[PDB]
Design an enzyme around this catalytic site. Sequence first.
Site, PDB file in Angstrom:
ATOM      1  N   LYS A 124      11.400   5.174   2.993  1.00  0.00           N
ATOM      2  CA  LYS A 124      11.074   3.710   3.314  1.00  0.00           C
ATOM      3  C   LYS A 124      10.011   3.438   2.309  1.00  0.00           C
ATOM      4  O   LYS A 124       8.876   2.776   2.548  1.00  0.00           O
ATOM      5  CB  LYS A 124      10.278   3.596   4.703  1.00  0.00           C
ATOM      6  CG  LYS A 124      10.371   2.120   5.505  1.00  0.00           C
ATOM      7  CD  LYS A 124      11.735   1.726   5.755  1.00  0.00           C
ATOM      8  CE  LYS A 124      12.092   0.532   5.064  1.00  0.00           C
ATOM      9  NZ  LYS A 124      10.955  -0.782   5.071  1.00  0.00           N
TER      10      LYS A 124
ATOM     11  N   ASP B 157      16.339   2.301   7.400  1.00  0.00           N
ATOM     12  CA  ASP B 157      17.002   1.170   8.028  1.00  0.00           C
ATOM     13  C   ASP B 157      18.422   0.531   7.474  1.00  0.00           C
ATOM     14  O   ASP B 157      19.410   0.485   8.035  1.00  0.00           O
ATOM     15  CB  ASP B 157      16.209  -0.029   8.402  1.00  0.00           C
ATOM     16  CG  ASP B 157      15.154  -0.536   6.949  1.00  0.00           C
ATOM     17  OD1 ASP B 157      13.976  -0.634   7.288  1.00  0.00           O
ATOM     18  OD2 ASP B 157      15.620  -0.227   6.145  1.00  0.00           O
TER      19      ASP B 157
ATOM     20  N   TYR C  99       5.645  14.721  12.912  1.00  0.00           N
ATOM     21  CA  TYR C  99       5.911  15.699  14.194  1.00  0.00           C
ATOM     22  C   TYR C  99       4.650  16.653  14.022  1.00  0.00           C
ATOM     23  O   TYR C  99       4.383  17.018  15.088  1.00  0.00           O
ATOM     24  CB  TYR C  99       7.228  16.597  14.120  1.00  0.00           C
ATOM     25  CG  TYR C  99       8.477  15.715  14.543  1.00  0.00           C
ATOM     26  CD1 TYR C  99       8.492  14.187  15.062  1.00  0.00           C
ATOM     27  CD2 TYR C  99       9.654  16.113  14.335  1.00  0.00           C
ATOM     28  CE1 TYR C  99       9.464  13.658  15.446  1.00  0.00           C
ATOM     29  CE2 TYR C  99      10.883  15.472  14.771  1.00  0.00           C
ATOM     30  CZ  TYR C  99      10.772  14.087  15.125  1.00  0.00           C
ATOM     31  OH  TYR C  99      11.804  13.485  15.476  1.00  0.00           O
TER      32      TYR C  99
ATOM     33  N   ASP D 175      15.790  13.024  12.142  1.00  0.00           N
ATOM     34  CA  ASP D 175      16.312  13.211  13.535  1.00  0.00           C
ATOM     35  C   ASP D 175      16.811  12.013  13.946  1.00  0.00           C
ATOM     36  O   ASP D 175      18.028  12.162  14.342  1.00  0.00           O
ATOM     37  CB  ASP D 175      14.939  13.156  14.450  1.00  0.00           C
ATOM     38  CG  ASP D 175      14.727  14.359  15.003  1.00  0.00           C
ATOM     39  OD1 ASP D 175      15.571  14.827  15.624  1.00  0.00           O
ATOM     40  OD2 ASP D 175      13.844  15.015  14.911  1.00  0.00           O
TER      41      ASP D 175
END
Lengths: 345, 344
Positions: A185, A217, A139, A241
């Site tokens: 990740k 995930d 971001y 988020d």
Amino acid sequence: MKVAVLPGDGIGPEVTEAALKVLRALDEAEGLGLAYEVFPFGGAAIDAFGEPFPEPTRKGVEEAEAVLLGSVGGPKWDGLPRKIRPETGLLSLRKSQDLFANLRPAKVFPGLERLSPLKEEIARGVDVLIVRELTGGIYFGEPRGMSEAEAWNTERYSKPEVERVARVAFELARKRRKHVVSVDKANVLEVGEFWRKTVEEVGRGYPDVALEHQYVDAMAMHLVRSPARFDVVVTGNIFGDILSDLASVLPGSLGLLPSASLGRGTPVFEPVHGSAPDIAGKGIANPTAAILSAAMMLEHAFGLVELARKVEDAVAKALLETPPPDLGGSAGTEAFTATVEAFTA
Amino acid sequence: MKVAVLPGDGIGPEVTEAALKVLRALDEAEGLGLAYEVFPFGGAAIDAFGEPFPEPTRKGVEEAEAVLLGSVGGPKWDGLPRKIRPETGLLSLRKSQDLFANLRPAKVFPGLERLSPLKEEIARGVDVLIVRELTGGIYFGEPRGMSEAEAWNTERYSKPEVERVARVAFELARKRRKHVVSVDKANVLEVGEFWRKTVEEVGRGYPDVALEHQYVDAMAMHLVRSPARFDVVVTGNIFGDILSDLASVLPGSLGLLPSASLGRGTPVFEPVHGSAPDIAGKGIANPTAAILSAAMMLEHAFGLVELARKVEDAVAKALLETPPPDLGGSAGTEAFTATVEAFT
């Protein structure tokens, strides 16, 4: 107990005024000596100071022990330079008080499972707290640019950036079911590796807390198949988020969700919903997340955990007893708040 | 109909053999002239060629029109140099055939809702297809590096990169419920903006298909609150990863998931499950995902849509009729396949 109230726009004033009605009633009953002052913020502050986060409001939060936020944004300011847009104001409030932890609780209160999209047996017992980093990540990562044929955005994290959030997560878990889950990740990105080893390294100081790593995930799926097993979930900006939003649906509706942003400065509590401009002043707004925001305020900013847990159930009772429109009901803002104040008072 | 069969390791052979049984029966019945050749791939290829994607297999898929893949990986090769680990083989197949789209269907067959984590009403009717970009994104974005106090990865996308995958999504939706949903984070990142206007721009050539835009987090929520309202969902590499996985839990079990990877080269179809090496040769492996991977092959590689939809139901019936162990049943691999080849 000095609270800086910032109603903001849309339903902000409607709902924050509801939370203050529940606060004042607890104040009378147990006399905690509440003290609060509203300050212009958001679009309101703009229409009055040409700036979303005017100095008077800037100074108001600095001097308070906690900030009670409402909603922010609307149509009247979309066409304004991002520099003073209502939302960039939220950014300046977070930046100014060095708030880097976003606490988004997703809980299913006993006897309310039926409202969940998941099966009564899967939803029963859910009580997870997604702790998200609010300052770093993709971001804000630089470089970032566009082109005729190419688009780029970089996800970057510093060491000090990750430590604090991780520390908040553990500290938080220590007071709850002592289980923290770090989500990254690391199996593919360097940033995930970095994150993992860092959290891993900071978790050393908290041997009494169980640390567990998961990929975003894999977590995306564990949060629907077995949400009731998690406690504290710490993760990055974007991932937090995606993950807070996901978990936010486990309890049923979105207007049921409070939020807190912890850091070095004055803590900020606010509903996770928007201004809903069109329904403003129609007495139909649901103050649940607002009140729930004032409960998180009571426990994480003032330590009154016994009290926060007190308004939490009074709210749970009210949602079951006299449900608001958005949850299949006729109880409007004013009415609902009455049912809650009844118990807490 | 020349098929290159790569059984792989673990239950790969068990389940791939089961899909071949179903294929050979259809081929007998309507006579589509199936032609297949098994090639060593994965751990097996390693144990015999020192590499996971040996030249003979490399050349076998090149010349076929489709690839039927099984499972890959296992204990025997975890301690090997990542350069020839079984899994890196899957990447060489992909890269050699330029497969850019990753089709990952998540569907709840009528009568099986009870298996889902969702409520019977919410799960009923789900039939979503998540099309994910396989070549670009943060997974391969440069620059990427680590340090003592700083980590960095870059998410970047080109124009051609996004066109193709968007084109696949629309073309696919055209044959389905005509509803595409692009998923991005355009409200914050430039990459999301670029993706949105690009998909928006290619959707022009598909007026008959309804395009919708949503942000990854919004979608992460909509796909659990109202999964039954979506059709084709197109997205980026990392976002497709988080989304595919999320949707893949809607249908009760993992083993019921097929998948295809389309690109410029030979199309690849394979279950979304692993080798489950300890349960190999036990006859209890569920061939559903493999069979369903043969269906997808039929429709997407050979156009036999009416046929693929024929095996799909035969499978559905079998799941309800004679369910496998992982789904609360006694029907082992062999027996389950029987009930399927009966109908087809």
